[PDB]
Amino acid sequence: SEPSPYVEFDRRQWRALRMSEQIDLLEVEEVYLPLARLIHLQVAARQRLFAATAEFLGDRPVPFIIGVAGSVAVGKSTTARVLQALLARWDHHPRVDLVTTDGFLYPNAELQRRNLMHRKGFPESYNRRALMRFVTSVKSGSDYACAPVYSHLHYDIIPGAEQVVRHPDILILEGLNVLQTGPTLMVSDLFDFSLYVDARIEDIEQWYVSRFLAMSDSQAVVAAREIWRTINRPNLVENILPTRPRATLVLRKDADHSINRLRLRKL
């Protein structure tokens, strides 16, 4: 017995911790609904702590910040979108808001000027100060805070489109680069709970190609497959994957989107 920081489960192990496109409905009650209860217990505990720096220094409570990481096409979006639903259902602490980090990308026009279209989605591609000032604002307890939005349809940022956040008990932060760390203070440092949505690399390709092409209608997969090899396959290896260990919870998804394994950080 030589100690690991994590605690790994399979679906059946984890499922037995219950209190009593198309989102698979089963996986909610088996994998997510339990996962939600975990976070509920930490939300109130993490409240006490922040309330203990306050009592030291001598006004609702502080936002709980949930990051959600993984490669593109793995299913961060829905994964997060779902937890927004279940967490809100607590009453004890409703008003979960969800913000995509994509809205913080530079507009393509900008990227063109800095020559970063081929490194689109990389950590260079974002507006980290704008991103943080925003996140910093939220958790401060700012009456409101505005965040931009992204168009996967139009392929860029929707100009003058504003997502408003109004002092939420809980915030969720879905993004490619999000669990990232650097010389500047970063948004990663502000999280109270991380999620990494993981899968196999050669496997994810198939999902992305499917994400594309379901959103020339033949052999344009060539194009799609090559944006993977050039942009999205890198960025996973160098920038995203290395953040996996620092996640609070990991969710390995099988070939057919099913979730078998769960490594959880207890320490």
Added chain:
Amino acid sequence: PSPYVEFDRRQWRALRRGLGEQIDLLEVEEVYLPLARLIHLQVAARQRLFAATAEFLGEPVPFIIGVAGSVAVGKSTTARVLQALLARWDHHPRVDLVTTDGFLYPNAELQRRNLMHRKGFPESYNRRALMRFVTSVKSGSDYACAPVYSHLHYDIIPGAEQVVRHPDILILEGLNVLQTGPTLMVSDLFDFSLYVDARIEDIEQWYVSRFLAMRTTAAADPESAFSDSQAVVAAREIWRTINRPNLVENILPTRPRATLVLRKDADHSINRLRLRKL
């Protein structure tokens, strides 16, 4: 909005034996003694949280305090003092203090890897050995052994073992300690960071003084050290080549991720305090 909250000594001061070169006794009651109270109130709160993953999984944990900064800035004594005050709580005694220096490779090793000029860098340490050790501590392992370093001998003391016996609180003093990488790291296991900061051109003076007063005042003491004038040349050059780098590239960048910062003035006094509330 900024994530931090900055104080001066007077501001912070209004929130209220041993030895070591010479620990200023005033700064205890004004800067440290308050700082200790802060940590006490987080220790019990952070207990509650870890006790909430437990209650979830269906059945206390060591509090881990990191202490960062450049060499010669005064991590050692800074930490050494907090060990004293924190222990005085009863609610949670048995603070143990471990230096990260003991985890350096032995020189002999470094020689083989050609890393003597990069000594103190993150390459210089045994990160796995360091972590299995830290991971072992916080697991709640009945005991755990950690090696030790010789600033006198200039290397690791062979077969010298510092034992840690399930402490309520542990302190982790080291150059590289608030570091982050692709491997899971000891930084990720901290519950509270300290950065001891000062000016760069300034610290040089202190280091040169750290050297030349150790290799002197107790070094020419048992003699069993090769100039007491203009060997500062040598000392000043180990700064420019080894210790000044490593601060810039490896240590300084970790400053923002610290829970508390302690800017020390030219003459060791502590004027400013940036604290992470968020």
